[PDB]
Design an enzyme around this catalytic site. Structure first.
Site, mmCIF file in Angstrom:
data_model
loop_
_atom_site.group_PDB
_atom_site.id
_atom_site.type_symbol
_atom_site.label_atom_id
_atom_site.label_comp_id
_atom_site.label_asym_id
_atom_site.label_seq_id
_atom_site.Cartn_x
_atom_site.Cartn_y
_atom_site.Cartn_z
ATOM 1 N N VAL A 273 0.830 -1.203 0.000
ATOM 2 C CA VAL A 273 0.000 0.000 0.000
ATOM 3 C C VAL A 273 0.869 1.259 0.000
ATOM 4 O O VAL A 273 0.534 2.256 -0.633
ATOM 5 C CB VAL A 273 -0.972 0.004 1.216
ATOM 6 N N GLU A 274 2.038 1.166 0.630
ATOM 7 C CA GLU A 274 2.961 2.296 0.731
ATOM 8 C C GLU A 274 3.708 2.710 -0.531
ATOM 9 O O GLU A 274 3.700 3.886 -0.888
ATOM 10 C CB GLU A 274 3.970 2.060 1.850
#
Ligand code: BLG
Ligand SMILES: CC(=O)N[C@@H]1[C@@H](O)[C@H](O[C@@H]2O[C@H](CO)[C@@H](O)[C@H](O)[C@H]2NC(C)=O)[C@@H](CO)O[C@@H]1O
Ligand code: CA
EC number: 4.2.2.n1
Length: 312
Positions: A112-113
């Site tokens: 997600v990062e």
């Protein structure tokens, strides 16, 4: 040869006549032995990015959850997540043994990062942090401490403060760590003696240490979907209800909650209605990384999606 330049007391650039920058320079010199002229030469190259200011200010049922989810959970992403998992399986397994944080959670976070290193950010950390410390009063103290820590990191890890890029908030590497998170929770997981946030192995052990330090309980459940609706009660990761209160509101756990006597009430907008969840302690821990219910559900579900795809 040696150029002290004691008389060059005035810097140029976007922060020249900024009182905050001068106070910060004084602090760094006094508190950490930083040379004023060296620091001034650095901050004179710093840029006041208006976009960083506009973005920080900017921070039914209509399918809100679904729109956020499709940004991270797609065939392409899950597939890339499998590749990353196998490529760094030893690092992930070793983090699991040392910190008790499962591979899917670390794979989910890093996914997600930065999409496992594909999107590290294009903003120079110095510009972002200087902008928020000097031209943003609301969170000027937090960011000033981040800038203070970033400059000490540049010195310790022998980095050039101007070369490092990251997010509009000054987050760095595979796990998008803020400078203070680096200072308190990052670890030399690769064993080369240096804590590099752009080293996949270091990011892995650092994400796990961050989790353990924030309460991650090994083997415990993250969240449990509920059968039923509970429209009367308020929701979010900050809420807190006993199982007894949730049951009396019309909910039942799809999985045994064990000794968990309390949970938060999570509500996801799935287009056709609302989906209710029992938020357990470990979900709260995921949000300590990024304060958001959507963020955490995406991290968890992506990790789970990647975990399944590896088995197939
Ligand atoms: C792992 C990590 O460093 N997490 C920190 C998180 O970073 C977030 C910040 C965010 C970020 O860079 N946002 C910018 C928005 S954008 O994506 O560039 O548009 N990404 C990072 C990791 O999730 O920010 C919050 C709040 O500052 C911190 O909590 S606090 O200490 O109580 O302040 C938290 O520790
Ligand atoms: C519009 C969109 O889909 N943007 C994505 C970004 O959201 C992703 O950026 C990363 O998002 C997390 C969650 O908010 C941040 O904590 C993190 O700092 C941020 N990363 C960077 C480098 O800014 C990006 C990576 O998945 O992918 C899309 O562009
Ligand atoms: Ca290392």
């Amino acid at each position: 040869m040696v150029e002290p330049q004691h008389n060059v007391m005035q810097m140029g650039g976007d922060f020249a006549n900024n009182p905050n920058a001068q106070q910060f320079i004084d602090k760094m010199v006094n508190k950490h032995g930083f040379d004023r002229q060296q620091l001034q030469e650095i901050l004179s190259q710093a840029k006041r990015l208006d976009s960083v200011l506009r973005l920080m200010d900017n921070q039914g049922p209509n399918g809100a959850w679904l729109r956020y989810r499709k940004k991270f959970i797609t065939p392409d992403n899950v597939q890339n997540g499998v590749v990353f998992w196998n490529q760094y399986e030893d690092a992930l397994n070793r983090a699991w043994q040392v910190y008790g944080v499962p591979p899917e959670i670390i794979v989910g976070i890093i996914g997600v990062e930065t999409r496992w290193g594909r999107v590290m950010g294009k903003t120079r950390i110095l510009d972002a942090l200087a902008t928020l410390s000097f031209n943003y009063p609301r969170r000027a103290e937090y960011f000033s401490g981040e800038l203070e820590t970033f400059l000490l990191m540049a010195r310790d890890e022998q980095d050039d403060p101007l070369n490092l890029k990251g997010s509009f908030a000054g987050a760095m590497g595979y796990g998008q760590f803020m400078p203070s998170s680096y200072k308190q929770y990052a670890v030399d997981f690769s064993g080369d003696g240096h804590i590099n946030l752009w080293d996949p192995v270091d990011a892995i052990g650092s994400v796990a240490n961050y989790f353990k330090a924030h309460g991650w309980v090994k083997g415990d459940q993250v969240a449990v979907m509920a059968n039923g609706q509970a429209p009367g009660l308020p929701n979010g990761f900050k809420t807190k209800y006993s199982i007894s209160q949730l049951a009396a509101a019309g909910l039942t756990p799809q999985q045994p909650l064990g000794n968990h006597q309390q949970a938060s009430l999570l509500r996801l907008d799935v287009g056709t209605g609302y989906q209710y969840w029992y938020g357990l302690p470990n979900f709260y821990t995921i949000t300590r990384y990024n304060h958001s219910t959507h963020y955490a559900m995406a991290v968890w579900q992506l990790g789970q999606a990647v975990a399944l795809a590896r088995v197939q």
